[PDB]
Amino acid sequence: NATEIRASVGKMIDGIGRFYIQMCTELKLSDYEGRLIQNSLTIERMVLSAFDERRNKYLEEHPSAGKDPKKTGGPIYRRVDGKWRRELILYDKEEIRRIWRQANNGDDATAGLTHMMIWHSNLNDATYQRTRALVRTGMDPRMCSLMQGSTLPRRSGAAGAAVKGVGTMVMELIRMIKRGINDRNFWRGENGRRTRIAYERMCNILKGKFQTAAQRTMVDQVRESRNPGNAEFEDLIFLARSALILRGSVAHKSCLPACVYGSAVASGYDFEREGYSLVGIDPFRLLQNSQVYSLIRPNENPAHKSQLVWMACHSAAFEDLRVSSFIRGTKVVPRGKLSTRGVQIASNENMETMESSTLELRSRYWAIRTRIQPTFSVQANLPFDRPTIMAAFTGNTEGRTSDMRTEIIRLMESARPEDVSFQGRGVFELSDEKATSPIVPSFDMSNEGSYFFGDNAEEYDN
Ligand SMILES: [K+]
């Protein structure tokens, strides 16, 4: 089966690569410019757009370049006369779709679109705080670590779901409910058994991430409300709190930008023939041989920009910094400590003071995602820091109450020498491709374990 799965995924990767190579030819990019990560973004967003049908399935459109709905594109950056120059290209969505399909042996390769969509999601996860979204949902900002895939477009399911975290689901459910509290037949008619079927589906997706019968059970109690309101809200928030301790099973998917794949395909790599898996050496191998540049703002530290992108590539934001640091071979610091802002350049920034720099995306070691395999690894889910504890164990002194609420607290209060939902990394030498010798990591215990400690990133909604 993996016999043909590695092929199937490989096949996808070829397609993104070929697509990218061709888009580079189209736009007449210099080798450097094609390796410019902000150009990679614009090109990815382009193809995503061309297939979105304005559904917000694959992306959210600004619309900072597209009033004419038949057309799509964004800022492309070229090096001219010792200056970085930004131009907005517009293309026919039809034309893009053409090129995309052509790069995919004539297929629709929806998996490729999704792969790019997740890469963006991962990049946003590494970059932007969601503190504001959480309060407006009545959640606790210390739940920031449950907010995987929080930034995925409002329509997706096929593969979108697996990467969303427990908080993201709670937030999405709460948002629905909250709007059944300004009613207007939100729950009656065609519409309100339409949404009622959505709501059901979501609760199930939620339920699935949960890894104890107590919490799943409690989820069912919420699903099978009927006019959902403040009652369920409370239970959900209760549920999110429990997810800080009895954590959910959430897929972390390591998806690289299109330029990396493009470059590998131009280097004659045959992904379909060789196979591809997101879960082990494959993305590490690619990143070791890659050459990606980035635009850089004055007073930003190239190394920090580098961290930001590495993290995103390896989908590592909600993972223990100490593990990341160990695999990278240089300290992976919390976002608050990072002398950089996001990879994308707001259209009002700038170009006069802009520079480019080389991204450092290598790693000292490589790793297999465990419990996806299960040898000797170490927990790569976040540590129990004070603030996680404090947010996990509150308003139960209060209000609502149940046998489901009492179990759960019970499980929480006693929560193991090891811990439920084991997201791992097994770590190997790059000189040990076949994985013959697990390295037992030695963490530096003085490092902060949470990407989100002292966070100060721009808030995502802006
Ligand atoms: K910062």
Author numbering: 21 to 391, 408 to 498
Copy text from the publication.
The template for transcription is a complex between the viral RNA and the nucleoprotein (NP) that binds to the RNA sugar-phosphate backbone. NP is necessary for RNA elongation by the polymerase. The nucleoproteins of influenza A H1N1 and H5N1 crystallised as trimers and NP of influenza B virus as a tetramer.
We then crystallised the obligate monomeric R416A mutant of NP. Even though the crystals of wt and mutant NP have the same space group, wt NP crystallises as a trimer whereas mutant NP crystallised as a monomer but with 3 molecules in the asymmetric unit; the cell dimensions are different and the positions of the monomers are different from those of the protomers in the trimer. Most of the mutant protein structure is identical to that of the wt, from residue 22 to 385, the rmsd is 1.09 Å for 364 aligned Cα's. In the monomeric mutant protein, residues 386–390 form a β-strand (β7) and residues 392–407 form a flexible loop that points towards the RNA binding surface. For trimeric H1N1 the last visible C-terminal residue is 489 and for H5N1 this is residue 496 and in both structures the C-termini point away from the RNA binding surface. In the R416A structure, E339 makes hydrogen bonds with R461 and the mutated R416A points towards R461; if the wt monomer structure were the same as the R416A structure there could be a clash between arginines 416 and 461. Therefore, the R416A mutation may both stabilise the monomer and destabilise the trimer.
